[PDB]
Amino acid sequence: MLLPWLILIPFIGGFLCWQTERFGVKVPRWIALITMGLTLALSLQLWLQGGYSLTQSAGIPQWQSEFDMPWIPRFGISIHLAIDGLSLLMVVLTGLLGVLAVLCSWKEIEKYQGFFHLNLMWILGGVIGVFLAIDMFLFFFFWEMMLVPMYFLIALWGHKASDGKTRITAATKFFIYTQASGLVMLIAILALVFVHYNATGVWTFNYEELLNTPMSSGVEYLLMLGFFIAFAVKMPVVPLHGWLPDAHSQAPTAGSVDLAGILLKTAAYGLLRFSLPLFPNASAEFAPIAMWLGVIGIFYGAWMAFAQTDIKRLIAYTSVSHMGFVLIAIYTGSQLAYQGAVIQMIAHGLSAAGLFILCGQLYERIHTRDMRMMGGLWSKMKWLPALSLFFAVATLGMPGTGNFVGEFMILFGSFQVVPVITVISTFGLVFASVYSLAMLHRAYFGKAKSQIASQELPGMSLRELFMILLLVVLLVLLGFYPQPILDTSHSAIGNIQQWFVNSV
Amino acid sequence: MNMLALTIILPLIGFVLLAFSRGRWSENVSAIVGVGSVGLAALVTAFIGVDFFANGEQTYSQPLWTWMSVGDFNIGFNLVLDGLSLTMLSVVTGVGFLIHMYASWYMRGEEGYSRFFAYTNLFIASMVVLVLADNLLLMYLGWEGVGLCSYLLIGFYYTDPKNGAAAMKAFVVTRVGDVFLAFALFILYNELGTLNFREMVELAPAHFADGNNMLMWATLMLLGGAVGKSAQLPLQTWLADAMAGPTPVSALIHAATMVTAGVYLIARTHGLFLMTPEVLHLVGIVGAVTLLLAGFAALVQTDIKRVLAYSTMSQIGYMFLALGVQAWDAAIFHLMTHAFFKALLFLASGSVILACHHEQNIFKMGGLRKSIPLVYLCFLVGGAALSALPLVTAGFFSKDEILAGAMANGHINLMVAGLVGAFMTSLYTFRMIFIVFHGKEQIHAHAVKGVTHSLPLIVLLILSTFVGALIVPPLQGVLPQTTELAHGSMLTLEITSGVVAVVGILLAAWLWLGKRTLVTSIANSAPGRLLSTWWYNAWGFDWLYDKVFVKPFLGIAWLLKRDPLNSMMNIPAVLSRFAGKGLLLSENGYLRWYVASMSIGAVVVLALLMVL
């Protein structure tokens, strides 16, 4: 019921901001803040009003709210929006990140600003629609239309048409690397539906009847690779992640909040929801390749993070290290491991968003991007580097932050299922420390005479500090007290694991 | 009595105030609030200590809230205040109180003031969490909590990068130990399910009827965690470099706070180490080989702070032996004495290096008895206890008891190790003060007089002596494995240690009382410098631990300066663009070849139809 409205407010707000662009220029900032407030209101209403602590073994079909509507009846394509417990965590996270995106874009007036915000709400609404998606075509359409408006963001707002490096390399690799694999998973969807159409005799694009379709061995394996390729180019996996640092280092850091904190979520959401239950034996065969790619991703991202000299590419290469833990979590037979991935995933978004906001904040203070050029700014800034120290501290497994409990319950479940690949995996924490300290010492520890421009520094406004203070206190409560959201996700995680166990 | 969290909240909350009053407060109010947090901690500790005496040595547990709970994974914020943990709390909330009270006077006059009293409170708070935790998880929060605080205090002076660069080697090395520590934590949950210490104690033999082979992996890798955090051979790197920070943080790190975490983990899991005897004796094996390493490196270099540091390494491993010889209460008795002397020994050295005014040398000063005898009596008291002198010393009872226990274990190599350690402690006891305080004063050390440090000096003077040895720590509340006692040979071993100490003290005094030309000759002899260079490398261990992984790590980073796999999956675009350029060049514009294209399409279509 609430789901059609909850995916449509982003699109309605873009229309109204661009409508009132003719009326005024200070309107869309204040319009956008209220519209994202309504998005979190409906999302938090579903958290509180709904039975978040529901039955742990109520089957694979279980939803607090559900919407159905005929869209293309010839294939049974329907607007099958349906919200689960873990999907509701995703919706509340993106509503909060949308508030941060529209708050960081405050006091940013240009030649056109309504165009920026209709695009801003369009891309955030696309991610919400992926998170509420049970029909395969609706899932794919939303997956691919959140991908078009970021291209305009990197192009027309990466820099205003002055340098050609903001389109022809950064934005173009971002677009092609995702869309080729999106078309791969579309033909994977179609091969799965056609083998189901031979089995039963109805053209259906719905998840519940495609869940248990009879397929011979050696056939569903190729479709599982087809799903995983599109789910491995969106979250950074080892062979195909070259788009991520270019995308984050060129887009404005509000666009980078969208590009890191929430676009990385949807691929592991799809690995939990759409790839694991549909292909149980194929995923059981593919598991060790996934573990090898996971350990390679953690070690690889940390080394590339240590070796880099700038900051946006630095945090962009932390992200590929973080997601390796999540991939190994998903491809195991443990309930605790999956519940560790969820808390690690929410904390991943919350620990990347603050760093990107602050890295963009530091650049507009000093007008210099290279990290090794500055140094010793602690005597000049009064609140930026202290808050930045805790966010770099929250990146690695420091307890009292959500990242520690996240990565570390994965390791418990991972050692429960398989010893040797887990005992390799744990060493990324040592490597997490070295790139964390490298960031901290090269940027803030030292003498302010490392740069001439490090001798005249501005002040920090109240609202940026307010939205940084909220994230640090929110992230500490998730580290100390993670029970409420684990009780929320228990049943959804449990039935996925029980199906992955029982179907093999 | 429902006041355990006040030993954590009151310090920790004070840190938050000093983390946001980034120098905007004045000197006095910042100084009072920084000392008062730790002062309230000691007072609440004393109340629960005297109530623990009123409890009849009965443990008191308090769960605040469950941390995380999955249906097979139950972790809670459980605090256990038993006899072993009360003693380890007593050391911290007294020593940190005394060290931090000195810092109220030492820190003033320079910037970074509110910053330093912020991170000290966090450092103390992390150490209290480790020794009161009831679950191995919450205790893990203690381990890397105090590690990050050592990073924030070793690299406290961020201006020059030597001490600003020395902290990360400790940070890397302590997290290697923490990976080793968490490995055993995974294995214990896989094997025995619950991580609570007591429930683990009477769950371990129930689950282990059939298979035992994998418990040695748990316990050996658990041991690898304990050793690394404080000091030991496989990971002895950072304690020389940890001296690059200020004097009070070196005392806190090296004396009794952070280095007393690896002792608490072996002692708390003593029944768990009793489940396997060979992993328990292996602690003493590694302890016996580190007393042979950690001693004479104090003699080698001319840095006073490196002197006090190699002595701490020697003493911590001396404990590992004491725990390996199944003498648990005696080892904590050694700790109870050891905290008192080391902290003062470190602190007094700081007062004189304030008076030295940038000397940092042991060979260019002399005749310091006439400058100020207060620091003279400070080193003197510390030296006597360390050397195992029988004259009104505090720690000699602890050495006598553990060697009695060690010979009750019956390992002649361990008494040989103990005998050479007593001789080696007496060697570097008075050699430092004889080479520094005796001679001629060509550079005057301007002594500073003030009651603000004299009163804690008197308190530390009256505490580090044998008056402090009369305070028996609470050890009857845990009922550990009983430290066995020997009579008749106790007097024989006592006089043997006294003779060994006296011979070492007389040899140092004979090194002093000679011309020192033979000392100069052995400091100039080529085999002497070879051994000095060999033990500059410290059995090549820092040499080996740099050149085994560091330059391979820098080499693979230099090979990863440009990202390979992003480039090697760009070759579809490279092949497509180059093949597209070739197809564009295939077009001509001359219309004869267009019609030839039409004929050559007809030819291939007919050929492709005739092969079907």
From Swiss-Prot, chain A:
The chain crosses the membrane at residues 1-21, 30-50, 83-103, 122-142, 174-194, 222-242, 259-279, 286-306, 314-334, 340-360, 383-403, 404-424, 426-446, 465-485. Residues 22-29, 104-121, 195-221, 280-285, 335-339, 447-464 are cytoplasmic. It is an enzyme of class 7 (translocase). InterPro entries: NADH_Q_OxRdtase_chainM/4, NADH_UbQ_OxRdtase, ND/Mrp_TM. It is found in: Cell inner membrane. One of its GO terms (cellular component) is NADH dehydrogenase complex. Its EC number is 7.1.1.-. Residues 51-82, 143-173, 243-258, 307-313, 361-382, 425, 486-504 are periplasmic. Keywords: Cell inner membrane, Cell membrane, Membrane, NAD, Quinone, Translocase, Transmembrane, Transmembrane helix, Ubiquinone. One of its GO terms (molecular function) is ubiquinone binding. It is a multi-pass membrane protein. Its main location: membrane. It comes from the Bacteria. Composed of 13 different subunits. Subunits NuoA, H, J, K, L, M, N constitute the membrane sector of the complex. NDH-1 shuttles electrons from NADH, via FMN and iron-sulfur (Fe-S) centers, to quinones in the respiratory chain. The immediate electron acceptor for the enzyme in this species is believed to be ubiquinone. Couples the redox reaction to proton translocation (for every two electrons transferred, four hydrogen ions are translocated across the cytoplasmic membrane), and thus conserves the redox energy in a proton gradient. This is NADH-quinone oxidoreductase subunit M. The lineage of its organism: Bacteria, Pseudomonadati, Pseudomonadota, Gammaproteobacteria, Enterobacterales.
